[model samples]
Target: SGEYPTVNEIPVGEVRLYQIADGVWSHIATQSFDGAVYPSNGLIVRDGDELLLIDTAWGAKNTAALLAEIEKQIGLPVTRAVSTHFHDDRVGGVDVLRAAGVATYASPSTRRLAEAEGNEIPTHSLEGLSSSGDAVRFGPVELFYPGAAHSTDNLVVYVPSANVLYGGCAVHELSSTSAGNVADADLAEWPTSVERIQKHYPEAEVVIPGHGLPGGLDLLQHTANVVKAHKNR
Candidate 1:
């Protein structure tokens, strides 16, 4: 759902960099947890050496390492990090970042579910942040919650500068042909929720799903179609 210009594209182990359009880049981290290897997204908003991370890596140690790697590459601290949802890939390093002095935030529902479930808890909450009205702008990034899907507290991030949409776990990659992990998903609400996600970031030229590859607006329709296929079966 986004684009900017172009820059350097880099990859290191589980972390990847997509210098899409302009200077805006998508930093993705991947790892296998309990046998599931997937990519979790985070955006890199840069002004010279300064940077902001949109979502965190999959867990405490992992988050810590990624942040260190980021700091090393940018030669500057990560001023802020936001959690797109309560999942470990999104908030897993919540505690680690806080300890390192990075401002971290999440929606109230995400904060609650994360803590209640004994996961790494974020220090701040974008609690009342909603998708219905204006987008919550923090520096260069905007956070939006368009209801639930992959998880009840799923939240999406919109990078106005780059026109990129971080659909989090609510919207899946085109490779996915099923509803996927309904354990915490509102399968009944999955269709509408995914639609709302696309509606909020309709202008997005780059679309980053919570896992796997990033695609264009077609990923939006592809996601809907897959969910439809799942329901039909």
Candidate 2:
């Protein structure tokens, strides 16, 4: 699958990069549908001579491209990585980063599930960051997890210096109000979780979701409204 610029005229996939904030960039994978579900997105934060990556994509193929793009843009090696949740799509590439001697982290819930399911958890890991309302900082970038929404293990990354929030699948900018997928969602608590996010960053200007394009505070309110509107009905 190492074909360049549209394999035989049919695009396999292409990684698109966007600068959400100074020293912070997001890599969004190409989507087949307008609102596809599995097109994983990740963040790269420049911290001095090292870089920090958030949520590695689905597999080796995607992760390799992501790393290459990051190196090309940031000109620094990724020194750390973090998984937002336990979904394979997000943690599948942990091994890729682990072999590179990069420190990887995940919430306790995510690590537990991964171990229970016979998935590997790298040597360097962190937990309780969400429970204690603590924040992980890489230079000027800081990430916090208020609570859970899309998954019980979901970790929200907040770049305080940039005033930009990365809400993993928990909050998405969709074109419709219909709940995309609630199989693992806490429908009753989803709205409150999102509200907590807003409370945490009252002045956040841009929100980078797990899917769809990057938007502003309106997207957070939209997610809350949609989830609340269809929580029971």
Candidate 3:
């Protein structure tokens, strides 16, 4: 069942916020490519008087819209943020967040890759990732590196209290018949990477993929299957 029922739906121009759980909102930003519009998902998590962002909107302007709406509706400033990967869909709003004085962070490898591509970079390095690139419990959420999959530096966010897994671009939506993009994907490691997520967060109920609707654990398996079929072909 893909209908996980959002508590509220707040739309800001091309960006939409879907509150899946108490204090946790899945923010989707739209962008056009090749004459078609697509949605990318991120998270807006409330922690008391402050907020935490997992990934940014599609780009700087979209992210600014997203942030301004949060301020208007939620009435709290984003105190911290993490870009799950170096892709525009993930790190696009890092510049805006940094400009707003939010402490932005990404894995070391993600920072390196983002810098290499001249994308807006998060100002800090994610601290809790294990030296071996495994899951580490950070402040309010768990930052996990399941290994290279969609991109070498892709990361997943697990909000244990809310039981939501922000799977970034590493995981695919169940409706996806094909793996969306593999330009920077690690085909050989994709399945294994997803397997790690399955093992680590078996309790994750609301799994948010980078695109489309959010689903349950089945989405992880669906993503693995999509990658498996593509790699085979």
Candidate 4:
């Protein structure tokens, strides 16, 4: 399916799963906030009795649809939902999951910012923040929050069993146009954050970005280069 449609309509609860590697999937919303900008990308990793949802989409309709897709495929309730950052597109539908009995988790900074921003923008509540290294273990899968990027409260998801790194909005696809969108980016610290991630997963074979297709280690290098070039410019 296409990354996103040109004409924006409320998402019909449709979800597409891209297999990044064994036991790791990237769930992308067909309907995004602004089509020209970033698309909402979330990750789902099968652990054991339940599945783990990384980030929710922009609207309640889309978030519900995403949860439905996960339940349909995994045949289990989503045990937990994790927010990568405080952006509404990433946490807008957070309340839906919270009401569904799923334990929502995010960094303290993300939660604080979400509450500080309130419903005006997409953000989480203080009830969702978790301590660093707090993990959600399902069966064979365990997701760890390695710290932040993309935004001040960004959280990266690591699946050790599959060696797949979900870099949230931190490590995006490599392209000339991608670099042009770094106006609000933390240019100076972006590379260092990536370096930390690299150190965390030295053996990761696949890297799943918040937006764009799943790629290999080269994508990480390219993103680092982009950050460096943007910092210099």
Candidate 5:
């Protein structure tokens, strides 16, 4: 329901950008690990003179390339970023972003999970999560965390202004027919979280999964449907 620009497989570890809105874009970064390829999704929002990245590629090096890619596309360096979770694919480029002087943020659970894996924590943390702190604004996003889903601290970055939802791994893409990699997921607690997202971002016409191509609100429903079926709930 927006201006969608044709995009190809970006070579920076296949970092492709999708133009969901006039100035909002989503970055899909892929990396190979353990004899398999994993894709990480984040937002590359270009609004006014400010550029905010949702997450980086998988590592510092790849994330550096991702920054370069942003400049190449919008001719502006990212000034701020938000990590959706603590996984490598979600926040792996954190080190590079820090080195570049980009401000980064995460939830308390996010920092906890990242540090548990010896990963550097965000320079800043969101405090005072009011019961409804579930709906907070960080730049162009309405940050949300219903509960454990893809990870214990997965945050759904929904740009209410742009109608774009970066569901991270909490919500899967339309290409996925399965519940996806659950090694770090909480199936028992995931359904409630995803269902909340579905009800929360009903206006999100463009939903980007942690991996695969981005789609519409139906993607959220598809994720809810799949997860429920997988658990036979």
Candidate 6:
């Protein structure tokens, strides 16, 4: 019932954009691995005249399309970006952003892991961020590193004006029955990390997962439950 209405939907190749709030839009960039096509979720939030991008598309090509479409349809330049973690789905488009002169940022731990994996890393390091508690504002958006969940360096994004939380891979969609990926996840810390989000953003009206439709705080609880179920099994 608290879901924000879609203001617009713009498609650029396999990537789609949906404006879900006054200055916030949801991005879904699709890709195929082996036999299945997967869609990764991200965000485009306006910070005054420019826009801030959260997460990138599956690859540089897709990310380019996402940016071009944003410039054409949204009529704004994405001057900054941040990847929630080090995974390809999170930081894959860093190169494109770099070429376009978009200041890309990631947590130190995320940069380290991404470097170890030989992926293109964010240009700048976001430091002094606690693992969990309150958020750190870079510009108009707020970032919180909720310890670890889906990955070792996962973080969440919050838009205070819209009351939307970009939970990323740290939180799972409500319809998710499985824990999904946990290759680099901190199982022992997943629950507490999520709880920290709930504790800090008690008024979060919309919670957007990393790979599916957005939902309310139930998505947060669903994510914790999914992790617990996976761990128990």
Q: What is the C-alpha lDDT of each candidate?
A: 0.72, 0.71, 0.84, 0.67, 0.77, 0.85
Task: Please report how far candidate 5 places residue 107 from its true position, in Å.
Answer: 0.6
- Residues 116-225, candidate 2, lDDT per residue (tens digit)? 76665645556447562456764456667666677777778888788888887777775546656666678777777888888888888878777666688888888887
Tens-digit per-residue lDDT, 1-233, candidate 3: 34432223323335667788999998777776566667788888888888988888878888999888787768898999989889888888788888888899998898999999988888898765634347776568888898889998888999988999989899888889899979999989999999999998999989999888898999999999999999999
Candidate 3 deviant stretches above 4 angstroms: 1-13, 128-133
Off by over 4 Å in 1: 1-13, 47-49, 130-134
Worst 10 residues of 4 by lDDT: 120-129
Q: After TM-score superposition, what is the CA distance of residue 85 in candidate 6 from its true location, in Å?
A: 0.3
- TM-scores of all models? 0.85, 0.84, 0.92, 0.79, 0.89, 0.92
125-232: candidate 4 lDDT, tens digit per residue: 433325443455534544444444456566677788888877777877654335534533677777777777777678888787766666777777787887676678
TM-score of 5: 0.89
TM-score of 3: 0.92
Measured on C-alpha atoms, candidate 1 has an lDDT of 0.72
* Model 5, position 159: C-alpha lDDT score: 74
Q: Of the candidates numbered 5 and 6, which has the greater TM-score value?
A: 6
Which candidate model has the greater TM-score, 3 or 4? Answer: 3
Residue 89 lDDT in candidate 4: 64
**Candidate 2 residue pairs in backbone clash:** none
Best by lDDT: 6
Number of the top TM-score candidate: 6
Give the runs in model 5 whose Cα sits over 4 Å from its true position: 1-14, 130-133
**Model 6: per-residue Cα lDDT over 106-224, one tens digit each:** 98988999999988899999986744664689787899978878987888999999999999999887778898778888778899998988998999998999987898999988888
